[model samples]
Target: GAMGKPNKQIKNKLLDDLKNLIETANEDRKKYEKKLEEEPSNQYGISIFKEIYWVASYETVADNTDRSKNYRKFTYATLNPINTNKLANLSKILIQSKQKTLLFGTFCNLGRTFDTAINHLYPKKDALDKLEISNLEKLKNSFEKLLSMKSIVSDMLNQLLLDYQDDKDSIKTDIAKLESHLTELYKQIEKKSSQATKLKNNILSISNL
Candidate 1:
């Protein structure tokens, strides 16, 4: 976890890196734009113009977004400080929870069923034999333990379902922002293509005259 306020050097360093990425992106855009202008209908189909457009667009947006978001995260993390030792303990808890969930996820994939839950609670054949001979006191303790296991497992499995659904929704949202840029890039390409064709036609028209 981020702990302290970052110094000016940190911010300056990050900004420098971002400037490099943005500059490179600008160069790529300009280079391609010139190519499109020089030969709108190059050896390849005009469709390639769109493909090249997305490559430059996606990379630029992805890095640019990271640059913006990282600064915000840096600010937030510094302001909301956590002790390193405490953070380590918290990290362990999270790691164990993930471990527990992953182990349970395999069981979940086997298919959910009331029968499956109940089957888990069922006493093993040898255990039942031991229970049969045991006093009421011992059997009562074993039954309680099984009941607690079933309740905890049920809650964890159901909670994992909500986590997965949230993940799906989050991923769906992430792509929408890129689309505006993609659409604008397409508009530029189309405009350039139309201009190129018009110029070529005008040259022919004058030559014929």
Candidate 2:
């Protein structure tokens, strides 16, 4: 689809959007590094996909939607499926291609967004800063734990891509296995979100002892 010839204006916009994504990504990396400094052990496992959602949601938009009759818009319903089987494979394919080379880059982008977000909530200085230092400590640890798990997912994703490419039958089996694993991971996040308040309390009570 991307190989299809397009009008000058449409092509220009696509190129422009690509450039913008790179710039924003750099800004995102700075924040991730800063956050990792504050809480080295924190694992917000959701950062990778969360950053993907964020970039796709806002950063990846093309400006010339009106002129390009064939151009398709991306949406969550199109990005994340309510049902796992119903999910769009195109997005996964694209993400995999992107991830193949950008594994560390993806991590950096996610790290940045996660850090900046917490910085806002915890506030190095700001009115909205309600995050206690102790809570931040726990949040960092939990977030990092999640991030580590996500790296494992990334590893699996890359391996599956390679194996799938090597043999379609093996890929099908992997697809089945990954689909089940993703469903389980999704449930865990939901559970985490529900208990986040209690977790926050436990984090804030942190002490030298």
Candidate 3:
């Protein structure tokens, strides 16, 4: 009886799966890109605040060490202008690796920043144009979907490579075993031929007698 499928068959199946994943990934990328293109331009800037806090001073007055410090902290929101070109550039970098890490970090930060902008703007909905608000939301959604697709595709690719390496090792081991079996068979054939030659010589001597 045979074990499961041969290594070659298993590898072909893995390659098929990887190909399908890549196809789907590319289709999804195209879909999201079209969605982004349909969205309104993000020309106006959004304000998202950062909290700044630090120790001002420390003073010891007596043996008990009474300390007085200024605890004033200034928190403010800075204008962040969104450009579609930059977002597209980010999508391009996702396929590429140590650079992928850097771009991914930026991708995450952009998501958080967009969330903050939407959160801040939603409450003051009546004060701003409704179109602008929805535009930000839609753009954020498309960018997020694209990034998630990239991550899934990358993971599948890594898994496929690992599987390929494992299959190659197993196939090499099988080849080595087959070669040793062949060598053993060759030795047996040589011994049998030598014995047959001795028997033929003896028969010739007996016939002559």
Candidate 4:
């Protein structure tokens, strides 16, 4: 239940931020287009979208019915893990999408921060977590950060494969990975369950607050 709530909250926050960034970004496109028309050597302007929009496109702002259903799908996967084990591999996909959604928003915000880094010279101009660099710098730095996160995520996917135990069968490599990861994580979490057993080594442990 706790995981379920946090997952949706985190996902919704990121998606909303991404939608904001895209709306701002389209304005940037118009500005660049207008400026390049005024000056020819502005091949730099043409490259703007190439640099930024790729990250922007990584953002999924256009949410229709199925588009907005990712969180619900994750909920289904999580609560129904046993019954849905056949669909277990897909759980990773939906979960990963939410992670990417958060990353996309962070990347987009960094883009805006960098775009205004020069303009926002005062210390008060930057948020603590904000990236304080030029637009171009944000592209390079934030993108590297995004890639690093993505790499970590990719490793996790690969690591998950180590969990699948279908007699080392190739057919369910993904399923094995799912089963393995779940087994390990669930085992690790029993510590919490144990802590919940008896507070202060006394009789109050089982009593409802």
The CA root-mean-square deviation of candidate 4, after full C-alpha superposition on the true structure, stands at: 20.9
lDDT of 1 by residue, 64-126 (tens): 355322322221121122322232332222232323232222222221221222233232312
Tens-digit per-residue lDDT, 1-209, candidate 2: 46765455554443344334334433443443443333222122222332332233453122223311111111211111122222233235433332322332333333333333333333221221234444433544543443343344334444444544565444345656445444453354334333433433343344212
Task: Write the number of the candidate with greater TM-score, choosing between 3 and 4.
Answer: 3
The local distance difference test score of each candidate is 0.31, 0.35, 0.31, 0.32
What candidate 2 gets wrong by more than 4 Å, as runs, is 1-136, 172-209
Best by lDDT: 2
The TM-score of predicted model 2 comes to 0.29
Better of 1 and 2 by TM-score: 2
TM-scores for every candidate against the unseen true structure: 0.20, 0.29, 0.24, 0.23
Q: Candidate 3's residue-wise lDDT over 90-132, tens digit each?
A: 2322232223323223333333332333333334333322233
User: What would the TM-score be for candidate 3 when compared with the true structure?
Assistant: 0.24
Model 1 residue 173 distance off true place after TM-score fit, in angstroms: 37
Give per-residue lDDT, candidate 3, residue 76: 6
lDDT of 4 by residue, 131-184 (tens): 222332333333233323323333433344443434344424465554445444
